[PDB]
Design a protein around this ligand. Structure first.
Ligand code: FES
Lengths: 137, 100, 85, 97, 118
């Protein structure tokens, strides 16, 4: 068949399935990639938290949290905890432009989870609040 | 009774050609440099066309070929150039050998 | 408020997560979202923003003109037809 | 003094201007299908005239109609409406791979 | 002048929608509007979630009321649409058919060099 990068539309019956589940039912891996930290949380389609992880929770502290390896470790831990609850396929929803933005996904892959879709939810203000002044460095 | 210059210009085949875009002309290969053929088609400037991959050796000096003209003179005006910059050659597509 | 998993969403093809992420990043870059976030990290004062935009427009115009000039002039980059003269 | 002298007239061979694809057509804010053709499928960003190939007047009309439809509940803002993902591709942009 | 009211109404049963449309057209007539026509674009899911009158809606019915009204009425009508409960959203625009299509002959080209100094 012809693969389309566009996600299947909720409310429309698609042939695509994963473990006998529809795309609307696949659990959701929210990734937040800040400059100083990276947080990962898996939730069900019904917004039920199943696993959470972060660089700080994995023992890394201060500047060491900003490394990509910390985000990879967080992804590994989150994937292990989610897989303990039966999570197999996930939809990745990544926000922020932190160093671990991709590494966390790799960790999930290393954790055993299968990523079927990558979604960017970076909060981009359509001319919203005023950011802080530029650093004089 | 001698024909005037105006009459010659009016009845010239080049004048009758109108615009040179996508017109079909018969040119002559008057020079060959490796796989580059220089073809004169009765215009002010010749045109350089690559030797075709098929029947390339069949093109030689004096061979008559069919050309689809794109422009008699290739000129362009750049940023700050007070006058147009020309490459002193035409732009044509080499359809292939022409047989009488 | 909008429906989710439609905007900025790329389906992973045959488990090729890296390729899907690359496609998503390229889409965001083409739409300028990545540069938008980078510029929105800190406030860019309006005079600075106007100067940068004008400089970018001038640079793009100059680059396009130079590319056109180079393409036009490279038509003469062939073997010398009158060597020895 | 002689018939062979050239005459003054507008260029008869002058080919017509390449009108924009929407020129002569009424762009409407309720025509979400037409408006969605000029927005990014993944972000909803309105394409520039160098991508849509539209004339300035039609580009401005399309932009105003898109903004009006978005603010009036006719068109999604952050993404192209999925019902129109298969409409004819008029914008000169390539995304995938 | 000629105005067009784009009206997104709460997805209700047909009698309720009829009552709401009748009430809205009655309000327009009270404010002095001569209603030229009424249209229906169907019931469809909203492009985004809309909250109105302490209630969130995901679907709504689309209607377009073409009418003529004195200018001073339009503001009043807007206020009425603000106070109605069955109206998810309502916007009065100048009718597009009153905006004539001044025909464009084409795209006149401009040299790119001048854009550096202009
Ligand atoms: S080219 Fe004439 S209206 Fe756009």
């Amino acid at each position: 068949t012809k693969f389309s990068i566009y996600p299947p539309i909720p409310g429309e019956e698609s042939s695509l399935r994963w473990a006998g589940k529809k795309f609307e039912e696949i659990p959701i891996a929210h990734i937040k990639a800040s400059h100083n930290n990276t947080q990962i949380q898996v939730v069900s389609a019904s917004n039920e938290p199943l696993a959470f992880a972060s660089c700080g929770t994995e023992g890394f502290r201060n500047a060491k949290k900003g490394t990509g390896i910390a985000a990879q470790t967080a992804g590994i831990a989150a994937a292990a905890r989610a897989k303990q609850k039966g999570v197999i396929h996930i939809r990745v929803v990544v926000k922020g432009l932190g160093p671990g933005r991709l590494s966390a996904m790799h960790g999930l892959i290393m954790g055993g989870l299968e990523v079927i879709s990558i979604t960017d939810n970076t909060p981009i203000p359509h001319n919203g609040c005023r950011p802080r002044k530029a650093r004089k460095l | 009774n001698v024909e005037s210059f105006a009459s010659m210009l009016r009845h010239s085949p080049l004048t009758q050609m109108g615009p040179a875009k996508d017109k079909l002309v018969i040119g002559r290969i008057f020079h060959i440099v490796e796989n580059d053929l220089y073809i004169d088609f009765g215009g002010k400037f010749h045109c350089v066309c690559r030797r075709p991959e098929v029947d390339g050796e069949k093109y030689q000096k004096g061979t008559r070929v069919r050309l689809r003209l794109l422009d008699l003179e290739l000129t362009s005006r750049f940023l700050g150039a007070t006058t147009d910059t020309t490459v002193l050659e035409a732009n044509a597509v080499l359809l292939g050998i022409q047989e009488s | 408020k909008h429906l989710k998993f439609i905007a900025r969403t790329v389906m992973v093809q045959e488990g090729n997560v890296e390729s899907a992420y690359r496609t998503l990043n390229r889409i965001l870059t083409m739409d300028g979202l990545i540069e938008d976030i980078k510029h929105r990290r800190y406030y860019e004062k309006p005079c600075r923003r106007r100067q940068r935009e004008s400089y970018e427009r001038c640079r793009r115009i100059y680059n396009m003109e130079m590319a056109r000039k180079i393409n036009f002039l490279m038509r003469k980059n062939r073997a010398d037809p009158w060597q020895g003269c | 003094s002689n018939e062979d002298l050239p005459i003054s007239m507008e260029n008869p061979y002058k080919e017509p201007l390449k009108k924009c694809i929407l020129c002569g057509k009424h762009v409407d804010y309720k025509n979400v299908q037409l408006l969605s053709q000029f927005v990014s499928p993944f972000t909803g960003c309105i394409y520039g005239r160098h991508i849509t190939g539209l004339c300035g007047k039609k580009q401005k009309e399309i932009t105003k109609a898109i903004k009006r439809a978005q603010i009036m509940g006719f068109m999604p803002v952050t993404y192209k409406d999925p019902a129109y993902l298969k409409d004819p591709k008029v914008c000169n942009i390539r995304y995938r791979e | 002048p000629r105005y067009e009211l784009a009206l997104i109404l709460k997805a209700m049963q047909r009698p309720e929608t009829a009552a709401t449309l009748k009430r809205t057209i009655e309000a327009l007539m009270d404010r002095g509007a001569i209603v030229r026509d009424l249209e229906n674009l169907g019931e469809r899911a909203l492009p985004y979630r809309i909250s109105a009158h302490s209630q969130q809606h995901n679907r709504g019915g689309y209607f377009l009321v073409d009418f003529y009204a004195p200018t001073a009425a339009v503001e009043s009508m807007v206020e009425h649409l603000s106070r109605d409960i069955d109206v998810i959203r309502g916007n009065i625009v100048k009718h597009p058919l009153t905006q004539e299509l001044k025909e464009c002959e084409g795209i006149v080209p401009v040299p790119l060099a001048e854009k550096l100094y202009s």
